[PDB]
Amino acid sequence: AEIYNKDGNKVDLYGKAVGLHYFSKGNGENSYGGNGDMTYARLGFKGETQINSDLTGYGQWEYNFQGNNSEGADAQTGNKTRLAFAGLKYADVGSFDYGRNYGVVYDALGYTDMLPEFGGDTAYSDDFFVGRVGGVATYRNSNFFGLVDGLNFAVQYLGKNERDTARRSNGDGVGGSISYEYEGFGIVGAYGAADRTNLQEAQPLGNGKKAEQWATGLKYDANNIYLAANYGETRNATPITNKFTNTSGFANKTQDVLLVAQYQFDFGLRPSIAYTKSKAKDVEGIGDVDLVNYFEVGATYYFNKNMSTYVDYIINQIDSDNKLGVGSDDTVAVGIVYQF
Amino acid sequence: AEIYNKDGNKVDLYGKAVGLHYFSKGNGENSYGGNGDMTYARLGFKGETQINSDLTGYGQWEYNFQGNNSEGADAQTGNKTRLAFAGLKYADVGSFDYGRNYGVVYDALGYTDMLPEFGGDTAYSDDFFVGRVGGVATYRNSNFFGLVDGLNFAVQYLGKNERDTARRSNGDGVGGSISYEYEGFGIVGAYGAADRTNLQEAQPLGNGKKAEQWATGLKYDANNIYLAANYGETRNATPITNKFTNTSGFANKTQDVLLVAQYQFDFGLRPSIAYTKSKAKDVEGIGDVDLVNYFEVGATYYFNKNMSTYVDYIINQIDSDNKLGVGSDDTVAVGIVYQF
Amino acid sequence: TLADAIAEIKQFNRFAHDPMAGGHRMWQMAGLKAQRAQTDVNNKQAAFDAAAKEKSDADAALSAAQERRKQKE
Amino acid sequence: SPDTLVVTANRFEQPRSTVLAPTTVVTRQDIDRWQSTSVNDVLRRLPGVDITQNGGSGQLSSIFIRGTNASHVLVLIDGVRLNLAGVSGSADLSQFPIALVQRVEYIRGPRSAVYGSDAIGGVVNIITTRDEPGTEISAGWGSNSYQNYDVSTQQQLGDKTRVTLLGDYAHTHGDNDGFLSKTLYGALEHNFTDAWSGFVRGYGYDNRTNYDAYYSPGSPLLDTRKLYSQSWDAGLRYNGELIKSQLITSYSHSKDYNYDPHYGRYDSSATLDEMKQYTVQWANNVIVGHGSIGAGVDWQKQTTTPGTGYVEDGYDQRNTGIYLTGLQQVGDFTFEGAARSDDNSQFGRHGTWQTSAGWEFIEGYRFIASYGTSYKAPNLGQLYGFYGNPNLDPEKSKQWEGAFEGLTAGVNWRISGYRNDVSDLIDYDDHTLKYYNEGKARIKGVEATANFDTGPLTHTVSYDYVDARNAITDTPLLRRAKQQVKYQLDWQLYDFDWGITYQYLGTRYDKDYSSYPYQTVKMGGVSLWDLAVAYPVTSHLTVRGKIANLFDKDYETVYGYQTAGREYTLSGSYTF
């Protein structure tokens, strides 16, 4: 909600609370998503200020707090800051921002990540360009300087991050994305490339330096309908863990396919269906294997903008014999949401 | 910004976001400040309420959240609450507060701590009186009961804090500070004394029980100009770490000199220059040595109160052969800020 | 490496007395290369001699120690 | 161009008429009309410029202004010594992409008193930044598999901030693969106030070029050169009504691999020349009387990598040049003057100075006299290589020039004679195997220029004569052409823009590299014609065609090495 809109400056505090639960057979080790109560509340602030008619500056930050944790030493587990960045929007030339934000490839992967709770599994966090990361500088053009309506492009530089874990570390990277929206229809294409750090190469799995991601997305949203299809391929970019070996690293090659079909009703209802798949190739000692392969069937009732309820049933098609100890169990989630 | 101002009560939520980066030759181990992405967001709330015409009560709190961290186990690293205190301001006699706040000596040290990112290194945190610490009770007089304009004084008692590390611990302490501002010029003098805990004495470096800090500050600020010069001396108060020995402790004696000269322009510009030096004496086995010895050269563009950008180049004059593993490398920092 | 540098010097020997040719640069350069690689070879020779000494000493050490084991057994 | 503004004379803007030394300026317009694809082709046609190249584009080339050595022309990029000569200590523009060139200011004559070292022949200030807003997508196909694709746009952000960007891809054959050049350029210029202004600017390029190398079995063929360069300039200008201040800093980094594709760019057989160049300049000018007085400092640091420039280890040479320049037009007189002292980390200090006088005896006809002393620092090779010698002194050049410029019935002409007594030339000695400081050279020549309109026709004719000789041996410095004739006929008709560039390059003297000892031989002097047409299809689309070396002449500039003849270029550009 907009709490402060004065002096040519406007502040929008946006926050929500989600009472959530996951069900599944067994304790939930093998469940796709998990099991139990997954309630969490997010708080964030967005701020703008028009310095000049043609130049305005903005800053946004978001944090997520989990409620499933106890009040002991594990209170902070799963608590983090998702987004924290700033930037300025010029009138037509474009806009430039910096901070902790989504990677260009997320722009392409946004079409599939429309599910209530699950979805966007391929778009891992703290990954090169697919998810939200810290240390990015992004430039964006809307409608190509107002030349061509609906066609906008963005470019992003990624400062190297040498962290303790290869899963969370990266190096110098670059990426770009283009999106043409016309009359409701939408097309997008994004590409990102970066260098893997010594820790990443040193990992038992994974080989090579050039970590590459790219994706193409298509969609149509109108008439209370939303269809979407994103196909993305990556090299040495996706993280992978082997429970049998209890060893991690990156995937020499990965193909990911996402498909979504959601309908919406006037009476605050939106049933959803989603197919997903990700196959890794040239895995060290496991050849080619499927990381995730499932169906979605879910729904969301929108009492209003500030109140909603939803359910999602994930038909995990992964088999138990999978060569990475992956969870071969179905799962379901039921959630209730308040948001201001 | 003021979000609630009703019923003789006023609440000012103040928060900002800073996209920051540090550059330096190499990985940044030897760099003065460091290297990499230092983006961070701070949130805080101040509140006042006029209980009576002559008596009003105030409460202030601030927290800092770091964005440089990943979403893994290190998310909470560097996240903390800077200030959290309360207190009451009487009409003329003065004001008294308690909580987690800056030490009286910080009052003197404020003149030098005007730099965009670096600066105020001597005013370390969780140190006796120079920086913000928890467990202080402070009383302040403004204009000496309204008798003499511009001459104000403060007194502070510091309850003992027995923490796990000598770096964060203290003992019973007392201190005072006086500041006379006349015609733009400003003068200040602060003194603090406390007892070191057994853990502090047990440390290999440092000797004696009376941990003492004191400082003197002079300035002239007007016409978009700000000059400042703080000279402070301490005994067994300043923290010191030896990479060669990988051992820490306190300095038997320390002299610190800080000088600042900043100009401001009508068109949202503010160039700055700063000299700094700190020499420790009677070091156990190291005689006298320099902890920090550098120049500053930087600038800041103020788009408006809510938006700004800045840069700072730190010419570290410390030599590599320093007998404490101190960073003998230069450094630079570039930052952008949104703040409401 | 020495044979290489000395082939490069035979290569550019032509230009040794030709001060205004490209090759006569690469010639002195090969000079430098050869004299270095030669010093290097000398150092490897010293180190190899030393290692051969140590190795012979060890070879005798075994004879003696296993005669001692035979006597003690 | 007559009576337009230049900066090269004393680093600050001034009408080029007011520069006493003979000057020429080429514009982006001028270059586009020539459909020039290399800087060497732009220079090859300026008077006193005599260029040689080992064939097509990118091929090793050397420029001789007024008959001087390649290492006697100072080449400036936006005003700072061209970094690609750094290691060589000699300008070579076959490899510098033409797309960055926007303005060429080119003043022939001693200029050490303004620019310091290695400014003997003249100053070429190639300004890469021009004030034409808009955006231009352009493409070009040519022979030798020439291809060029270039997107560029410069636009205003406010009223004080202009952002300029361009990307360009270019490939040519002409050797078996030729020259491949990829360039990216970004620059932002702000106007803090009416007089305060500042600018950042970064640009890089990659150049893969193939060449013929001496083959020896069992030994690598270093026949491929990969050059990666980037530059970062940052400046601050105060342009007031009486005082002008320039604070300029630049940092150029360059990596120059020569290798055998088979062996690899990083294989031990590969030669890597890494070179870092830093420059800090301060210039101040105060309008005094009918003129101004200027005084600056310019400092440069050159660091090299072991191996770089055929030298064992990598060296650090620092040079600071303090200078002062005065200029005052009294009545019909004009007195310009400059003094300089460059202190190099290599050879201590060395002084230099030139002074020119311009008396206007008749209104529209004046006599310019000028003298200059100029130095040249010994270069990386002749200092730190095995042939090198660190105690070498700079090469000295005394230069005197007399000229008459005048306007006669619609023709602007200049007749001028120049003397150049280069002394203390650095020469290598056979009987000692070291670089010595012995040689001398007596250069005498005449420059006769005339440009004139006749209705819609524009004629730019010029004759050049140069007699460069060894002052000791009295033998003429070889590979120079006795005399050149450069004549360009420009006449656009029915919006068709036409241009016939002619050039007769006289008789060179080159050495033959077939038999040994290498015998000096006379090169024939030949004429070369080039035709250029340009039509505007749309008020955006402009298609231009060019036939370069119309008559397919069998000229050579390096005896033995063939240079492309007949060659065509079709191109289109879309300005909006």
Swiss-Prot record, chains A, B:
Database matches in InterPro entries: Gram-neg_bact_OMP (IPR050298), Gram_neg_porin_domain (IPR033900), Porin_dom_sf (IPR023614), Porin_gammaproteobac (IPR001897), Porin_Gram-ve (IPR001702), Porin_Gram-ve_CS (IPR013793)
Biological process according to GO: monoatomic ion transmembrane transport; protein homotrimerization; protein transport
Extracellular topological domain: 24-38, 67-82, 101-134, 160-171, 196-210, 236-252, 282-291, 316-330
Induction: By growth in low osmolarity conditions (low sugar or salt); activated at low osmolarity by OmpR, repressed at high osmolarity by OmpR (at protein level). Levels of OmpF protein decrease in a lon/ycgE double disruption (at protein level).
Top-level taxonomic group: Bacteria
Deletion consequences: Leads to decreased susceptibility to a number of hydrophilic antibiotics including ampicillin, cefoxitin and tetracycline. Deletion of ompF confers resistance to colicin E5.
PROSITE patterns in the record: GRAM_NEG_PORIN
Subcellular location: Cell outer membrane
GO cellular component: cell outer membrane; membrane; monoatomic ion channel complex; pore complex
One Pfam match: Porin_1
Record key words, sorted: Cell outer membrane, Ion transport, Membrane, Porin, Protein transport, Signal, Transmembrane, Transmembrane beta strand, Transport
GO molecular function terms noted in the UniProt entry: colicin transmembrane transporter activity; disordered domain specific binding; identical protein binding; lipid binding; lipopolysaccharide binding; monoatomic ion channel activity; porin activity
Effect on the protein upon substituting residue 117 to G: In strain: B/r; AA sequence
Parts of the chain that traverse the membrane: 1-6, 8-23, 39-51, 54-66, 83-91, 94-100, 135-141, 150-159, 172-182, 184-195, 211-222, 224-235, 253-265, 268-281, 292-303, 306-315, 331-340
Membrane topology listed for this record: Multi-pass membrane protein
Main location class: membrane
Residues in the Periplasmic compartment per record: 7, 52-53, 92-93, 142-149, 183, 223, 266-267, 304-305
Function statement: Forms pores that allow passive diffusion of small molecules across the outer membrane.
Family classification: Belongs to the Gram-negative porin family.
This protein's name: Outer membrane porin F
Gene source species: Escherichia coli (strain K12)
Gene name, Swiss-Prot/TrEMBL: ompF
Swiss-Prot record, chain C:
Cystine residue pairs: none
Superkingdom of the source species: Bacteria
Family: Belongs to the colicin/pyosin nuclease family.
Function: This plasmid-coded bactericidal protein is an endonuclease active on both single- and double-stranded DNA but with undefined specificity. Colicins are polypeptide toxins produced by and active against E.coli and closely related bacteria.
Record protein name field: Colicin-E9
Upper taxonomic lineage: Bacteria, Pseudomonadati, Pseudomonadota, Gammaproteobacteria, Enterobacterales
Shown stretch of the complete protein: 365 to 437 of 582
Curated annotation (Swiss-Prot), chain D:
Binding site for Ca(2+) 1: 175, 177, 212
GO molecular-function term, one example from the UniProt record: porin activity
Phenotype upon changing residue 7 to G/P: Inactivates uptake
Topological domain spans for side Periplasmic: 1-134, 156-160, 190-193, 240, 288-289, 332, 363-364, 406-410, 453-455, 492-496, 535-546
Domain TBDR beta-barrel, chain residue ranges per copy: 132-576
The UniProt record lists the keyword Ribosomal protein: no
Deletion phenotype: No longer takes up colicins E1 and E3; colicin K uptake does not change.
Residues that coordinate or bind Ca(2+) 2: 175, 177, 211-212, 223
Keyword annotations: Calcium, Cell outer membrane, Ion transport, Membrane, Metal-binding, Porin, Receptor, Signal, TonB box, Transmembrane, Transmembrane beta strand, Transport
UniProt motif (TonB C-terminal box) ranges: 559-576
Extracellular side: 143-145, 211-224, 259-270, 300-314, 344-346, 380-395, 421-434, 472-478, 513-519, 559-563
Keyword Ligase: no
Induction: Constitutively expressed. Primary control of btuB expression by cobalamin occurs at the level of translation initiation.
Span(s) of short sequence motif TonB box: 3-10
Subunit text: Interacts with TonB.
Protein name: Vitamin B12 transporter BtuB
